[PDB]
Structure formats: structure tokens, C-alpha cells
Design an enzyme around this catalytic site. Structure first.
Site, PDB file in Angstrom:
ATOM      1  N   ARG A  78       0.811  -1.316   0.031  1.00 45.53           N
ATOM      2  CA  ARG A  78      -0.021  -0.085   0.123  1.00 45.53           C
ATOM      3  C   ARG A  78       0.708   1.271   0.198  1.00 45.53           C
ATOM      4  O   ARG A  78       1.917   1.153   0.546  1.00 45.53           O
ATOM      5  CB  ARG A  78      -1.016   0.059   1.080  1.00 45.53           C
ATOM      6  CG  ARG A  78      -2.069  -1.125   1.246  1.00 45.53           C
ATOM      7  CD  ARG A  78      -2.925  -0.784   2.339  1.00 45.53           C
ATOM      8  NE  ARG A  78      -2.318  -1.197   3.802  1.00 45.53           N
ATOM      9  CZ  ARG A  78      -1.648  -0.283   4.546  1.00 45.53           C
ATOM     10  NH1 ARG A  78      -1.542   0.789   4.341  1.00 45.53           N
ATOM     11  NH2 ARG A  78      -1.198  -0.989   5.833  1.00 45.53           N
ATOM     12  N   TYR A 226      -1.263  -4.076  -6.837  1.00 44.04           N
ATOM     13  CA  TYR A 226      -1.007  -4.736  -5.486  1.00 44.04           C
ATOM     14  C   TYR A 226      -2.142  -5.038  -4.502  1.00 44.04           C
ATOM     15  O   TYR A 226      -2.726  -3.854  -4.176  1.00 44.04           O
ATOM     16  CB  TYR A 226       0.299  -4.444  -4.949  1.00 44.04           C
ATOM     17  CG  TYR A 226       0.975  -5.408  -4.068  1.00 44.04           C
ATOM     18  CD1 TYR A 226       1.946  -6.019  -4.586  1.00 44.04           C
ATOM     19  CD2 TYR A 226       0.814  -5.391  -2.703  1.00 44.04           C
ATOM     20  CE1 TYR A 226       2.618  -7.183  -3.859  1.00 44.04           C
ATOM     21  CE2 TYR A 226       1.467  -6.239  -1.980  1.00 44.04           C
ATOM     22  CZ  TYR A 226       2.605  -7.222  -2.595  1.00 44.04           C
ATOM     23  OH  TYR A 226       3.058  -8.248  -1.843  1.00 44.04           O
ATOM     24  N   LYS A 235      -9.429  -3.061   2.041  1.00 46.58           N
ATOM     25  CA  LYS A 235      -9.188  -1.967   2.811  1.00 46.58           C
ATOM     26  C   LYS A 235     -10.143  -0.827   2.237  1.00 46.58           C
ATOM     27  O   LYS A 235     -10.711  -0.294   3.171  1.00 46.58           O
ATOM     28  CB  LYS A 235      -7.885  -1.471   2.659  1.00 46.58           C
ATOM     29  CG  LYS A 235      -6.749  -2.710   3.155  1.00 46.58           C
ATOM     30  CD  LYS A 235      -6.991  -3.158   4.519  1.00 46.58           C
ATOM     31  CE  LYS A 235      -6.009  -4.007   5.127  1.00 46.58           C
ATOM     32  NZ  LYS A 235      -6.216  -4.311   6.584  1.00 46.58           N
ATOM     33  N   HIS A 255     -10.295  -2.862  11.837  1.00 45.75           N
ATOM     34  CA  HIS A 255      -9.193  -3.392  11.618  1.00 45.75           C
ATOM     35  C   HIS A 255      -9.039  -4.739  12.576  1.00 45.75           C
ATOM     36  O   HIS A 255      -7.834  -4.506  13.356  1.00 45.75           O
ATOM     37  CB  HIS A 255      -8.146  -2.537  11.451  1.00 45.75           C
ATOM     38  CG  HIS A 255      -6.807  -3.137  10.690  1.00 45.75           C
ATOM     39  ND1 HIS A 255      -5.705  -2.592  10.989  1.00 45.75           N
ATOM     40  CD2 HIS A 255      -6.736  -4.495   9.920  1.00 45.75           C
ATOM     41  CE1 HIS A 255      -4.881  -3.195  10.082  1.00 45.75           C
ATOM     42  NE2 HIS A 255      -5.407  -4.467   9.376  1.00 45.75           N
ATOM     43  N   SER A 277      -1.219  -3.297  11.034  1.00 44.83           N
ATOM     44  CA  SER A 277      -0.552  -4.050   9.884  1.00 44.83           C
ATOM     45  C   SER A 277       0.472  -4.701  10.204  1.00 44.83           C
ATOM     46  O   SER A 277       1.507  -3.912  10.705  1.00 44.83           O
ATOM     47  CB  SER A 277      -0.462  -3.296   8.689  1.00 44.83           C
ATOM     48  OG  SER A 277      -1.821  -2.715   8.446  1.00 44.83           O
ATOM     49  N   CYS A 279       1.388  -6.703  12.914  1.00 46.51           N
ATOM     50  CA  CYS A 279       1.475  -6.817  14.007  1.00 46.51           C
ATOM     51  C   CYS A 279       1.091  -7.927  15.089  1.00 46.51           C
ATOM     52  O   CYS A 279       0.789  -7.635  16.360  1.00 46.51           O
ATOM     53  CB  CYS A 279       1.482  -5.336  14.910  1.00 46.51           C
ATOM     54  SG  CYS A 279       2.338  -4.172  14.142  1.00 46.51           S
ATOM     55  N   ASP A 302      -8.554 -10.174  10.031  1.00 42.56           N
ATOM     56  CA  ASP A 302      -8.142  -8.847   9.442  1.00 42.56           C
ATOM     57  C   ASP A 302      -9.242  -7.799   9.653  1.00 42.56           C
ATOM     58  O   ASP A 302      -8.777  -6.746  10.000  1.00 42.56           O
ATOM     59  CB  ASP A 302      -7.626  -8.740   8.089  1.00 42.56           C
ATOM     60  CG  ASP A 302      -6.919  -7.607   7.832  1.00 42.56           C
ATOM     61  OD1 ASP A 302      -5.939  -7.139   8.357  1.00 42.56           O
ATOM     62  OD2 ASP A 302      -7.340  -7.011   6.538  1.00 42.56           O
ATOM     63  N   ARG A 396       2.958 -11.989   0.366  1.00 48.02           N
ATOM     64  CA  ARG A 396       1.733 -12.417   0.848  1.00 48.02           C
ATOM     65  C   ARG A 396       1.298 -13.971   0.180  1.00 48.02           C
ATOM     66  O   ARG A 396       1.700 -14.421  -0.670  1.00 48.02           O
ATOM     67  CB  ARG A 396       0.582 -11.353   0.463  1.00 48.02           C
ATOM     68  CG  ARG A 396       0.822 -10.117   0.930  1.00 48.02           C
ATOM     69  CD  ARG A 396       0.320  -9.939   2.296  1.00 48.02           C
ATOM     70  NE  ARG A 396       0.626  -8.674   2.886  1.00 48.02           N
ATOM     71  CZ  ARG A 396      -0.030  -7.864   3.875  1.00 48.02           C
ATOM     72  NH1 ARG A 396      -1.022  -8.695   4.632  1.00 48.02           N
ATOM     73  NH2 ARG A 396       0.260  -6.846   4.600  1.00 48.02           N
TER      74      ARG A 396
END
Ligand SMILES: Nc1nc2c(ncn2[C@@H]2O[C@H](COP(=O)(O)OP(=O)(O)O)[C@@H](O)[C@H]2O)c(=O)[nH]1
Ligand SMILES: O=C([O-])CC(=O)C(=O)O
Ligand SMILES: [Mn+2]
Ligand SMILES: [Mn+2]
Ligand SMILES: [Mn+2]
Ligand code: NA
EC number: 4.1.1.32
Length: 613
Positions: A78, A226, A235, A255, A277, A279, A302, A396
């Protein structure tokens, strides 16, 4: 009339407003063909095989139906600075920062966007197929589910959306003449190519722009293929657009992971957790607990859509249909359930490939047989001692949720699952104890608001500098963060509301020479055990200036050796004086006139408790 260009489906079969959306953008973008996705296995396999033909993806021969894409190195995560929200007034999108640079979003005027749009989209799909992706966010017939239509010129996007959402003909049939969110995407490389194609990955880095127009119910993304930039349900829709809708309609779009945890007494509770993100969300959501008689099941990893029902229960659904997880660090020892999930029907992006056709990345903890070599994510030969990683730090896996060996039996229940605790946390090397509990809902909202965490590779932020990331949603607020705080606070005045207990964790505290004080992963079940008891009303807490912490001996540390306890649970006056001043200045600068009275009050209260130690 673009009927003649339709190579799958029919414009006539589309709902009125869906046809107008497709045709209007076909007129603008000038695709060669229009493909209305049906979401079938046949469509999927053929599209994958076509991408393989064109050198866009490689098949991974060690596995059942797994694939690998290696991107242009300019398109790898991102980009928060090229991600914008358009509203009439800037203040509706972000608080007006005293310092003049907001760290809580990025606003663009209607006028500036129109110019940007005209500079990008006309003719952008020339010589390409425009794929029409009907998708549902959330379980089949959930009252909490929302449908979108994504137009894209990327087969990679189509394939990934099949995994990450419920997509296809049945979604169109469910939509009827109802409303949908309009999602438009282009890689921004019309044919013939004006610029060289790098690694068979179509993208336009200079013109990359990820835009949201909530008042038009539109998401418009250009130049990146991406994940977070191109998979518009995730998102852009389920956080940015949805958080604004949630504000309007009395629910929450967050989130957060959702997990179900069962104790040795046969009781089950559901918990949600917001970590920034990269974590620890995916790892907690599908944790393999080390404590005997405990079980964790995954609802989502997520995003959470949450709404208080008529009985006052905070009911949550996972709006996604898959996991788009960070690959590096994933191993049998750290996340065995992820490893099992990704063995089949999975798309990998920017990981390494072994000579046996297997996947590889940093932290995979998987010694290779003598003779097996590695091709890096850059398509070059790679050795274990080499300078650069074999996989991109933000590489990913994209995998179906149904394949998780511990997927919750209610992960697709339409009414959702009742959340009894909400956990906040991030990467803090110093000062912050392993776990504490908020003193009230208002204190809990402050705790969320005050979150800080080391930068990760999920976006463009380099280094490990500690950043404010309130509610783990700094890159994702669909509207003014002050108003978001107000929205959260308002839940306490909703009739019948059963407000979840709020905790803050820190898995990432390091000692005086840089090693973790807490083993984490499966051992985090010891912290969840404590939370579970606190929800039940257990007398297991001691009061401190930052909130409740476990009493002496309340935490199960059996089998963990001599864990350095009061280094891990230590609360320093000097650290917390610094902390509160930093939070004060941040909130004053960034939130200003839009800071709720109650958050300022909690700030004052914390400062006072600290002053008395
Ligand atoms: N030390 C430590 N690392 C963790 C823990 N949980 C996750 N990680 C690592 O953090 C990275 C991102 O984890 P992930 O669960 O995918 O976070 P997400 O992006 O929020 O879903 C991975 O490399 C994990 O191995 C933990 O409890 N302790
Ligand atoms: O960019 C994405 O879609 C992956 C993600 O969940 C994050 O980075 O928070
Ligand atoms: Mn995320
Ligand atoms: Mn993750
Ligand atoms: Mn109040
Ligand atoms: Na490629």
C-alpha cells in the site's frame, strides 16, 4: 451499447444500475472485451492457466493448485501518500491538524480529483479485457453483508478476489436492484504499451492513486496491481467506505481479528483484536494454544464488522472470505494452522521458490535437503548467506478461509458472533507491560486512541520508528478521527449495550540487549486465559496507574522457566510521564477541535494517576 464486446455473461442479465456502471466505464476506459465473472471453478482454472501462458504467474509444482506471482519492485505494498478520500469539506475526512500535516488520512478536493481522474482513466483499458466482479463482503445472507461490483483489467485481481470475497453469479442474483458499492480499478497500462513492462507485471507507479468517494459510493484505484491497492473489497471498501457507513448507520467497521476461545471448563467466548498491519493479528486469530484444555478457533484475521443487536450483544462478522497474510515469519512452529491452510488452492506473491517447486521465505524455519536451491522473489538465484532477503518483507499468501484447520463453526453464521472482549496492541520495545485492562469503556477508547507501534513493511514507512496508530486504523479511517472517537464513545449511551472489556497487550517488549521478554505465539494463550477469567468476573487483577494488571501468580507461567516478571510487567513513572506528554501533544496537534471531551478527560486522569506514583 457495448453488448458486442461481451465475452462472458450478458449486459441484459445485469441489474439496471450494474449495467449503467459497466457500460459507462467501458465507454471511458475503452476495453477490448468485457468479461462478467461467474465465480465458477472453470472460470478460475482457465484464467490461472491463461496467466501462466502469458508469463504473469508460475505454477508451484510441490502443491495442489498453488501459484506464484512476482511483481514489478515498484508495486509491492500500500502507498498511504497516494491514498485519498474526497469530500466537500476537508474536516469531514480528517481533523484539521494544528501543525498543518495530518497523520490521520489524506483529503483531496472534488476538483483536484476530477482533474487527476481525467489524466488517468480515459482509454486506460485499450486492448485489454474489463472483468466485472460481483462480490459480497460477509456471509451469504448476513444482514451485515454488503455487495460491491469491481471493474478491473487485471486477471490477478479477479483470481485474488475469488479467494478474498464471495464472488460470482449468485451474488448478482442476490443483489437484484439493490445498492452496491462501485469499485473501478486499472493497472494503467493501455495497449500498445507506452512504457516497458517489468517482470510481466502491469503497473503505473507515477500515476498510482487510490481514491475513495464515500458520498458517491465509489472507490477508484489506478496504477497498482498490489493487494490493498487493487483488491477493492478489502481495505478500500470494508474499512474506508464501511467505517463511514458504520458511523452513519450505528455499527463499527474495524481492523480486527475475531477468534473463539474455549476453556477447560467447556465455556466459549469470542474476542476481537486490533493490532496494526503486520503486528500479530493472523497469528493470534489462528493460534495453537500451548495451555492444555484450551482451544482457539478463527472467525477472521483482519477485518471485523460489528453491530449491537436488540439484546445488547456486540455481534461481529468477518466480511472477508480468505486470508491475505504476511508470509515471512510464518513457520510450522509459529503458525502451524496457517502452514496447513496454504498447502492448496493458494496464490503467493513475491515469495521465493525452491528447486522442488515449493515456497520459501525468511523465518520459514524449514531446512532444505542438500542440493535444493532457491530462486528469490526477484527471479535470481539466492543463497542463505546473501545480503538481501529471498522474499519481499511484504510478500503475501492469499488463501481460502474455509481451509483453515481451526476455522470456527460459526465463521459464516449470518447473525455473527458475540464479542466479549476487545484487545488493542502494537510493537513497543520499552515501557509497556505484557497486558493491562482498561478501567472503563471511556478509558478503553482512550487506550485505543493512544496506540503506538513500530513501523512495518505493510505500507511505505521504512525503519522501525514508533508511530501513532490509533485503533490500528491510521491508514484506514474513512472519516474524521475525532468523530470516530465520538462514535465509539456513543456506544456507552446506547440502550441495552453490553460493552466488551477492553485490554491492551504487548508481545514485543525487549530487554536491555534487544531480545524479547515474552516468547509469544502459542504462549499468548496464557494472556488470553487471564482475559477470559476477567470477563467472567474473576478477582485476578491489581490496580495500577495505567489500568488493571494480573495479580502476583495470576498468570500461568508453568513450563516457561524463569520469565523475567517485573521487567515484563514493570511500570516506570519516568516512562509514563514521557508517554502521557507525548499522547497529549499528539492529540492536541492531530485531533484538536474534534477531540471528544471524554478522551481529554481520560488523558487528564492518566496524567494524574501517574503524578501520584
Ligand atoms: N515475536 C512475535 N512475533 C509475532 C507474534 N505474532 C505474529 N508475529 C510476527 O509478526 C509478523 C506479522 O504477523 P501477522 O499475524 O500476519 O500480523 P497481521 O498482519 O496483523 O495479521 C509475522 O512475521 C509473525 O511471525 C508474536 O506473538 N510474537
Ligand atoms: O494491503 C493489504 O490488503 C494487506 C493488509 O491486510 C494490510 O497491509 O493491513
Ligand atoms: Mn490488515
Ligand atoms: Mn496478517
Ligand atoms: Mn459519555
Ligand atoms: Na511476474
Amino acid at each position: 451499447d457495448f453488448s458486442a464486446k461481451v465475452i462472458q455473461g450478458s449486459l441484459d442479465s445485469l441489474p439496471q444500475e450494474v449495467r449503467k456502471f459497466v457500460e459507462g466505464n467501458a465507454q471511458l476506459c475503452q476495453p477490448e472485451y468485457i468479461h462478467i465473472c461467474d465465480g465458477s471453478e472453470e472460470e478460475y482454472g482457465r484464467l490461472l492457466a491463461h496467466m501462466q501462458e502469458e508469463g504473469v504467474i508460475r505454477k508451484l509444482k510441490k502443491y495442489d493448485n498453488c501459484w506464484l506471482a512476482l511483481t514489478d519492485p515498484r508495486d509491492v505494498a500500500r502507498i498511504e501518500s497516494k491514498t485519498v478520500i474526497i469530500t466537500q469539506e476537508q474536516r469531514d475526512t480528517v481533523p484539521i491538524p494544528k501543525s498543518g500535516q495530518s497523520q490521520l488520512g489524506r483529503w483531496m478536493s472534488e476538483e483536484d480529483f476530477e482533474k487527476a481522474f481525467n489524466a488517468r482513466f480515459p482509454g486506460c483499458m485499450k486492448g485489454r479485457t474489463m472483468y466485472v466482479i460481483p462480490f459480497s463482503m460477509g456471509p451469504l445472507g448476513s444482514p451485515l453483508a454488503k455487495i460491491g461490483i469491481e471493474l478491473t483489467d487485471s486477471p490477478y485481481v479477479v483470481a485474488s478476489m475469488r479467494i478474498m470475497t464471495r464472488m460470482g453469479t449468485s451474488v448478482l442474483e442476490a443483489l437484484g436492484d439493490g445498492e452496491f458499492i462501485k469499485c473501478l480499478h486499472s493497472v494503467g497500462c493501455p495497449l500498445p504499451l507506452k512504457k516497458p513492462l517489468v517482470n510481466n507485471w502491469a503497473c503505473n507507479p507515477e500515476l498510482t492513486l487510490i481514491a475513495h468517494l464515500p458520498d458517491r459510493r465509489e472507490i477508484i484505484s489506478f496504477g497498482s496491481g498490489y493487494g490493498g491497492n487493487s483488491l477493492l473489497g478489502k481495505k478500500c471498501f470494508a474499512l474506508r467506505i464501511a467505517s463511514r457507513l458504520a458511523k452513519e448507520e450505528g455499527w463499527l467497521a474495524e481492523h480486527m481479528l475475531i477468534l473463539g476461545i474455549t476453556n477447560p471448563e467447556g465455556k466459549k467466548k469470542y474476542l476481537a483484536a486490533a493490532f496494526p498491519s503486520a503486528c500479530g493479528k493472523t497469528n493470534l486469530a489462528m493460534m495453537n494454544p500451548t495451555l492444555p484444555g484450551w482451544k482457539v478457533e478463527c472467525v477472521g484475521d483482519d477485518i471485523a464488522w460489528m453491530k449491537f443487536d436488540a439484546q445488547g450483544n456486540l455481534r461481529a462478522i468477518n466480511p472477508e472470505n480468505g486470508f491475505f497474510g504476511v508470509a515471512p515469519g510464518t513457520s510450522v512452529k509459529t503458525n502451524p494452522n496457517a502452514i496447513k491452510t496454504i498447502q492448496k488452492n493458494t496464490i503467493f506473491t513475491n515469495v521465493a521458490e525452491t528447486s522442488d517447486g515449493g515456497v520459501y521465505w525468511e523465518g520459514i524455519d524449514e531446512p532444505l535437503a542438500p542440493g535444493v536451491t532457491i530462486t528469490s522473489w526477484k527471479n535470481k538465484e539466492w543463497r542463505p548467506q546473501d545480503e538481501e532477503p529471498c522474499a519481499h518483507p511484504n510478500s503475501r499468501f492469499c488463501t481460502p478461509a474455509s481451509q483453515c484447520p481451526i476455522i470456527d463453526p460459526a465463521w459464516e453464521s449470518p447473525e455473527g458472533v458475540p464479542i466479549e472482549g476487545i484487545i488493542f496492541g502494537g510493537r513497543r520495545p520499552a515501557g509497556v507491560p505484557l497486558v493491562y485492562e482498561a478501567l472503563s469503556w471511556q478509558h478503553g477508547v482512550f487506550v485505543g486512541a493512544a496506540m503506538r507501534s513500530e513501523a512495518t513493511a505493510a505500507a511505505e514507512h521504512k525503519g522501525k520508528v514508533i508511530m501513532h496508530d490509533p485503533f490500528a486504523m491510521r491508514p484506514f479511517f474513512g472519516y474524521n478521527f475525532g468523530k470516530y472517537l465520538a462514535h465509539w464513545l456513543s456506544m456507552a449511551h446506547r440502550p441495552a449495550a453490553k460493552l466488551p472489556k477492553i485490554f491492551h497487550v504487548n508481545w514485543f517488549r525487549k530487554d536491555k540487549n534487544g531480545k524479547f521478554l515474552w516468547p509469544g505465539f502459542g504462549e499468548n494463550s496464557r494472556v488470553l486465559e487471564w482475559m477470559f477469567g476477567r470477563i467472567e468476573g474473576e478477582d485476578s487483577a491489581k490496580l495500577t496507574p495505567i489500568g488493571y494488571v494480573p495479580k502476583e501468580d495470576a498468570l500461568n507461567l508453568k513450563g516457561l522457566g524463569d520469565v523475567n516478571v517485573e521487567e515484563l510487567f514493570g511500570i516506570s513513572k519516568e516512562f509514563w510521564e514521557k508517554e502521557v506528554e507525548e499522547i497529549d501533544k499528539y492529540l492536541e496537534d492531530q485531533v484538536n477541535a474534534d477531540l471528544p471531551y471524554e478522551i481529554e478527560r481520560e488523558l487528564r486522569a492518566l496524567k494524574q494517576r501517574i503524578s501520584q506514583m
